[PDB]
Amino acid sequence: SSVLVLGRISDDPASHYEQLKPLLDYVVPRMREVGIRRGEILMAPDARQMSSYLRRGRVDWVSETTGAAMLLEQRGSAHPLLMTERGGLRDFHTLFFVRRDSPIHSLSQLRGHTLALQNASSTSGYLLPMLELLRNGIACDVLLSADDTPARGSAGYLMVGSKLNVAAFVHKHLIDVGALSNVDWDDERHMPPVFKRDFRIVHRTAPVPRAVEMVRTGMDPAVEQRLRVVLLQAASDPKAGPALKRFFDTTGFRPLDPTSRRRLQELSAGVQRVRDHVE
């Protein structure tokens, strides 16, 4: 509580540490006037455990994609501070893709076929695609392995972890359809051009805001206000551009406007619906 703890949900803590530390080092000295003296990094493996840390006060601030953010909010653990723009983009969406040779040409044809998804905390790799299926009445059962097959008339999904794995499993004929964000699609670490050229897009979800800064339930109001101000000013401060670069290429923060708020509400309902019906 004289300590500011920055975190994120992470399956690779050793590598995401470097993305958080620079910005934290920029932030902490500018927070002295509200009682902050030092900064710490605490990451968690999924949204459930991050919520626990949030609720117990072990983490103060996380920067997340908006579906993941709403998981945190729904679990009583955090609330939005600022909207975050990354890679020059305020928004993103999910796309579904197949091998070009695939008999699949539309979302509806997922019925009877498999879907590669990322992890349960992924906005673009889990929450958006499942929501889209729910919306189209397309049942999707968890499959246990790559030998497991969907129900006739339902889709089934296989959790493969990484974004590269979604692309890999689909390229190699192990799964019929993959889900990635439009942004991951043009990112060569996650969608290698040797795979991409064999793929075809068959469906796009509506866009959502890309990311949000969230702060924990019970944060002291003054610390909250000052962190907000600091982050708002960081964008236009050359002393922060390198750290912002590292902070998932953050190119912008902006206030929660009524539009972004209602879009988060919409998203939250949708995420609550995924959660309710994929328990």
What's the per-residue H, E or C state across the chain?
CCEEEEECECCCHHHHHHHHHHHHHHHHHHHHHHCCCEEEECCECCHHHHHHHHHCCCCCEEEEEHHHHHHHHHCCCEEEEEEEEECCECEECEEEEEECCCCCCCHHHHCCCEEEECCCCCHHHHHHHHHHHHHCCCCEEECCCCCCCCCCCCEEEEECCCHHHHHHHHHCCCCCEEEEEHHHHCCCCCCCHHHHCCEEEEEECCCEECEEEEEECCCCHHHHHHHHHHHHHHCCCHHHHHHHHHCCCEEEEECCCHHHHHHHHHHHHHHHHHHHHHC
Q: Which residues share a beta bridge with 79?
A: 215
Question: Which one-letter amino acid corresponds to residue 30?
Answer: R
Which residues on neighbouring strands pair with residue 194, listed in sequence order?
none
Provide CB contacts within 8 A for 244, sequence distance 6+: 23, 234, 235, 250, 251
Query: Cα(first)–Cα(last) distance of the chain, in Å?
Result: 35
Question: Which candidate, 120, 119, 114, places its Cα nearest to that of 96?
Answer: 114
Picking from 10, 19, 62, the residue whose alpha carbon sits closest to that of residue 248 is 19
Kindly state the tokens that stand for 83.
């909207």
Long-range contacts of 255-264 (CB under 8 A, 24+ apart): 255/82, 255/83, 256/80, 256/81, 256/82, 256/83, 257/83, 260/83, 260/209, 261/80, 263/208, 263/209, 264/66, 264/69, 264/70, 264/80, 264/209, 264/212
Residues 6+ apart with CB under 8 A from 85: 210, 211, 250, 251, 252, 253, 254
**What are the tokens at 238?**
């050359």
In Å, the largest CA–CA distance within the chain is 62
Per-residue b/e over 26-56, b at no fewer than 16 CB within 10 Å?
A: bbbebbeebebeebebbbbeebeebbebbbe
- CA 179 to chain centroid, in Å, comes to 13
Q: How is residue 30 written in tokens?
A: 């500018």
- The residue whose two tokens read 């990322």 is 118
State the burial class of residue 21 (Cβ atoms within 10 Å of its Cβ: 0-12, 13-18, 19+): middle
Asked whether 210 and 92 are in contact (CB, 8 A), the reply is: yes
124 with 181: CB under 8 angstroms? yes
What is the distance between the alpha carbons of residues 187 and 176, in angstroms, rounded to a whole number?
A: 21
Calpha distance 89→210 (Å, rounded): 7
| In contact, 269 and 66? CB cutoff 8 Å | no
Helices 47-55 and 66-74, packing angle to 10 deg: 50
CA–CA separation, 74 and 235 (whole Å): 29
Q: Contact 72/9 with Cβ under 8 angstroms?
A: no
Residue with tokens 């988060």: 264
Contact 57, 223 (CB under 8 A): no
**Residue pointed to by tokens 């890679």:** 87
How many CA atoms lie within 13 Å of 119's alpha carbon, on the beta-carbon side?
A: 15
Question: Phi and psi for 223 in degrees, rounded to 5?
Answer: -65, -50
Q: What is the C-alpha to C-alpha distance for residues 143 and 71, in angstroms, rounded to an integer?
A: 23
**Inter-residue contact 261 to 69 (CB < 8 Å):** no
Question: What is the domain partition of the chain in residue ranges?
Answer: 1-89+208-279, 90-207
Tokens of residue 117, six digits: 């998804």
- Which pair of tokens denotes residue 198? 């064999």
Are the C-beta atoms of 186 and 180 separated by less than 8 Å? no
